[PDB]
Design a protein around this ligand. Structure first.
Ligand SMILES: [K+]
Ligand SMILES: [Mg+2]
Ligand SMILES: [Mg+2]
Ligand SMILES: [Mg+2]
Ligand SMILES: [Mg+2]
Ligand SMILES: [Mg+2]
Ligand SMILES: [Mg+2]
Ligand SMILES: [Mg+2]
Ligand SMILES: [Mg+2]
Ligand SMILES: [Mg+2]
Ligand SMILES: [Mg+2]
Ligand SMILES: [Mg+2]
Ligand SMILES: [Mg+2]
Ligand SMILES: [Mg+2]
Ligand SMILES: [Mg+2]
Ligand SMILES: [Mg+2]
Ligand SMILES: [Mg+2]
Ligand SMILES: [Mg+2]
Ligand SMILES: [Mg+2]
Ligand SMILES: [Mg+2]
Ligand SMILES: [Mg+2]
Ligand SMILES: [Mg+2]
Ligand SMILES: [Mg+2]
Ligand SMILES: [Mg+2]
Ligand SMILES: [Mg+2]
Ligand SMILES: [Mg+2]
Ligand SMILES: [Mg+2]
Ligand SMILES: [Mg+2]
Ligand SMILES: [Mg+2]
Ligand SMILES: [Mg+2]
Ligand SMILES: [Mg+2]
Ligand SMILES: [Mg+2]
Ligand SMILES: [Mg+2]
Ligand SMILES: [Mg+2]
Ligand SMILES: [Mg+2]
Ligand SMILES: [Mg+2]
Ligand SMILES: [Mg+2]
Ligand SMILES: [Mg+2]
Ligand SMILES: [Mg+2]
Ligand SMILES: [Mg+2]
Ligand SMILES: [Mg+2]
Ligand SMILES: [Mg+2]
Ligand SMILES: [Mg+2]
Ligand SMILES: [Mg+2]
Ligand SMILES: [Mg+2]
Ligand SMILES: [Mg+2]
Ligand SMILES: [Mg+2]
Ligand SMILES: [Mg+2]
Ligand SMILES: [Mg+2]
Ligand SMILES: [Mg+2]
Ligand SMILES: [Mg+2]
Ligand SMILES: [Mg+2]
Lengths: 177, 115, 79, 66
RNA sequence: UCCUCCUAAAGAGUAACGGAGGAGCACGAAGGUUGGCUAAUCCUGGUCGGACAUCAGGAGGUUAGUGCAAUGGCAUAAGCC
RNA sequence: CCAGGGCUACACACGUGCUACAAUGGCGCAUACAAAGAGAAGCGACCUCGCGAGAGCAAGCGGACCUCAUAAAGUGCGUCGUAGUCCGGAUUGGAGUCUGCAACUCGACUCCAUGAAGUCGGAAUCGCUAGUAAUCGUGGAUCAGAAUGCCACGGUGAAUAC
RNA sequence: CGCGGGGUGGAGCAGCCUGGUAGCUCGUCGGGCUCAUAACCCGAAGAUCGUCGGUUCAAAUCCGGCCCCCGCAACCA
């Protein structure tokens, strides 16, 4: 709730002056943070996905959905309705709580973090980070995990352009290159 | 047991614990523990948290981990861009310090190949 | 590397460079002194170092300073 | 949210060596200890110190000095 | 022997050693019914992750899907949970 | 006659070595025992500067005196506890030192970081019958500089030979 | 023209008519052994399966055409 109230108390204002918005609803707001973890190696070992889910459930608050394979493909030897990855679609209250914990204490533990890519936008304000390790989040014990399976964070917003959506994140002291 | 970029050892003496940092060897590690005012015989489990924060500022003096990796990667990439004898040596995957390249050179050249 | 008592260049190459730099840019200098280091004043000159059988032109840049001239003229050709 | 199935999402106090005390809510346990934060990380100075590393001509002048 | 398309001349039917394909089962849920859903192919962006696994968006508008051939059908979906 | 370059190239194959793969071992501190040889544009103390290669000032000695020269394995305490490890120390980046007209092709050594292959080796196969094999250091010749080679020297010191 | 069967490391054979797996024996290259060669011993590579298309999540293996190849038939007047 801290970043949530920060948005309303500050930021709501800061963005109004930049793009001379007519109304307060025109300002981009952050909709959902979708944590994906396409484990993939679960074809060989079935438990390996259950280990990844335990890690996502630790990293986020809520428990992840086990995503099925959409179509069968020969390139990786998978079939229709096979559990291939994990996801969490966290939004609302716990979203802002996670979003604080991400930027404020998780990003800084990225190995040799110099600057995050400002050109990593979808052409519609929706940002996508990809973390290499789990260890960067302080929820994982060091002697528990035995495999470097990263996730990828995807911040979805209401902006109609990446330039409009950059300022939104940048206004939360987001480390860009 | 979380200083610099990585350093997470346990059941290991302090001097040998800090060798696990990239950019810190055996002699460098003794200079850290001398300046910090910590005995080399103790281990990180035995140490307290008040002492570990003094090690964090001490290793911050020296260039370590990704600061170092980039400094090395810059210097090698510099040579290759010049097109000097060392640069040609680097990109070709052959030994640089005027070494024998006929019989041995297996570390730089890699394992054996067919003809 | 060797030599703390003055970075080394041949008398003939120093006087040829000082004469070339004061006049202005012209052409590749035929030089056989590979051993000789590179000074800051040499930057801009396209001096031609002897590889063994011919002279290889080398446009001197900001980086090519601490290095020696023979480093930019491979002697043995391979493949 | 669906109760029972999720893990215990309890409040905890983050306290780094810098001095920034900070309450948060996460699935850890009792307390936390951090190295760095959004404040106190060298990215604002890091990029200043990292980019201005090159310099070959002055390095030569520092050896010869004449 | 059986089913689908044409030949078949805009009702039905209509031959040839005419032209093309299928079937001899499957299923206790792949039936019933209430409640919800909506698809291919892209283009972007994204940890390994590649031409293609998973996520996020957009553009698309049924180009899909329908236990099995084809034809006729299917959004109120007969498709998907 | 001369400047460079080359003899040091490198998909690969073999020969001869060295260093390994560790715990009878690795790294630190306490400190004991050799033999032989060398030296005048030589060998170069005590010093004093240096983290260290070394650098200045210079003692003595053409030597049973002076110097290179603390031999190292070896004890004695410590600490790591079988890990690609505090094993290995390759390979590279940076910073240097000496020699030398000159060290990039192409030297040696030093410091710092780096920390590869390698967990005892397929078919084969080699030397060795006692101060020998094994293993530790040591010196000299050629030599401005440049040994893991060569030629010598001594430490500890086995097994086995029906 | 009809009808079965074929076409896979350099050679000859399996794996092919039950869709996801490429073996065997020689030969070749490397190292041993020998005075040397052979024999012998120890390692290593070498085929996207006739070709062009389908079907399929995926084809050496299913189906269709086309190019060689064997075997069988082209009979009564
Ligand atoms: K009729
Ligand atoms: Mg280290
Ligand atoms: Mg070292
Ligand atoms: Mg050499
Ligand atoms: Mg040529
Ligand atoms: Mg009709
Ligand atoms: Mg009709
Ligand atoms: Mg009619
Ligand atoms: Mg009729
Ligand atoms: Mg039929
Ligand atoms: Mg039936
Ligand atoms: Mg049911
Ligand atoms: Mg029904
Ligand atoms: Mg539209
Ligand atoms: Mg359809
Ligand atoms: Mg159809
Ligand atoms: Mg139904
Ligand atoms: Mg339906
Ligand atoms: Mg020779
Ligand atoms: Mg060479
Ligand atoms: Mg040599
Ligand atoms: Mg040996
Ligand atoms: Mg050793
Ligand atoms: Mg030892
Ligand atoms: Mg060691
Ligand atoms: Mg050591
Ligand atoms: Mg003395
Ligand atoms: Mg002395
Ligand atoms: Mg003094
Ligand atoms: Mg001293
Ligand atoms: Mg000296
Ligand atoms: Mg000295
Ligand atoms: Mg004498
Ligand atoms: Mg003496
Ligand atoms: Mg000596
Ligand atoms: Mg003596
Ligand atoms: Mg163990
Ligand atoms: Mg390794
Ligand atoms: Mg180690
Ligand atoms: Mg290995
Ligand atoms: Mg191994
Ligand atoms: Mg042995
Ligand atoms: Mg045998
Ligand atoms: Mg030894
Ligand atoms: Mg010796
Ligand atoms: Mg001598
Ligand atoms: Mg020796
Ligand atoms: Mg085979
Ligand atoms: Mg052979
Ligand atoms: Mg062929
Ligand atoms: Mg299909
Ligand atoms: Mg196949």
């Amino acid at each position: 709730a801290k970043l949530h109230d920060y948005y309303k108390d500050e930021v709501v204002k800061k963005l109004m002056t930049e793009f001379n918005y007519n109304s307060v609803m025109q300002v981009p707001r952050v909709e959902k943070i979708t944590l994906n973890m396409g484990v993939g190696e679960a074809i060989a070992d079935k438990k390996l996905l259950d280990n990844a889910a335990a890690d996502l459930a630790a990293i986020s608050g809520q428990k992840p959905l086990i995503t099925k394979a959409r179509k069968s493909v020969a390139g990786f030897k998978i079939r229709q309705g096979y559990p291939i990855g994990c996801k969490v679609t966290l939004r609302g209250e716990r979203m802002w709580e996670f979003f604080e914990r991400l930027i404020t204490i998780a990003v800084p533990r990225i190995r040799d973090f110099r600057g995050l890519s400002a050109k990593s936008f979808d052409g519609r304000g929706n940002y996508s980070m990809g973390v290499r390790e789990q260890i960067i989040f302080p929820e994982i014990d060091y002697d528990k995990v035995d495999r470097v399976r990263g996730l990828d964070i995807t911040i979805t917003t209401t902006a109609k352009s990446d330039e409009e959506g950059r300022a939104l994140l940048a206004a939360f002291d987001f480390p860009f290159r | 047991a979380r200083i610099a970029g990585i350093n997470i050892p346990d059941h290991k003496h302090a001097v040998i614990a800090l060798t696990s940092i990239y950019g810190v060897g055996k002699t460098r590690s003794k200079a850290i523990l001398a300046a910090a005012g910590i005995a080399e015989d103790v281990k990180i489990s035995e140490l307290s948290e008040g002492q570990i924060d003094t090690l964090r500022d001490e290793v911050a003096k020296f260039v370590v981990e990704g600061d170092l990796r980039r400094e090395i990667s810059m210097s090698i990439k510099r040579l290759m861009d010049l097109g000097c004898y060392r640069g040609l040596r680097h990109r070709r995957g052959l030994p640089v310090r005027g070494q024998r390249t006929k019989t041995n050179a297996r570390t730089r050249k890699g394992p054996r190949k067919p003809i | 590397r060797s030599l703390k008592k003055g970075p080394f260049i041949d008398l003939h190459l120093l006087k040829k460079v000082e004469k070339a730099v004061e006049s202005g840019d012209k052409k590749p200098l035929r030089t056989w002194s590979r051993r000789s280091t590179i000074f800051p004043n040499m930057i801009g000159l396209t001096i031609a170092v002897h590889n063994g059988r011919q002279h290889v032109p080398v446009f001197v840049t900001d980086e090519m300073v601490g290095h020696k001239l023979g480093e930019f003229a491979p002697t043995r050709t391979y493949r | 949210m669906k109760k029972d199935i999720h893990p215990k999402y309890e409040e905890i106090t983050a306290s780094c060596s810098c001095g920034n005390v900070m309450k948060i809510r996460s699935t850890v346990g009792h307390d936390l200890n951090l190295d760095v934060c959004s404040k106190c990380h060298p990215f604002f100075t890091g990029k200043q110190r990292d980019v201005a590393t090159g310099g070959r001509v002055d390095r030569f002048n520092k050896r010869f000095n004449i």
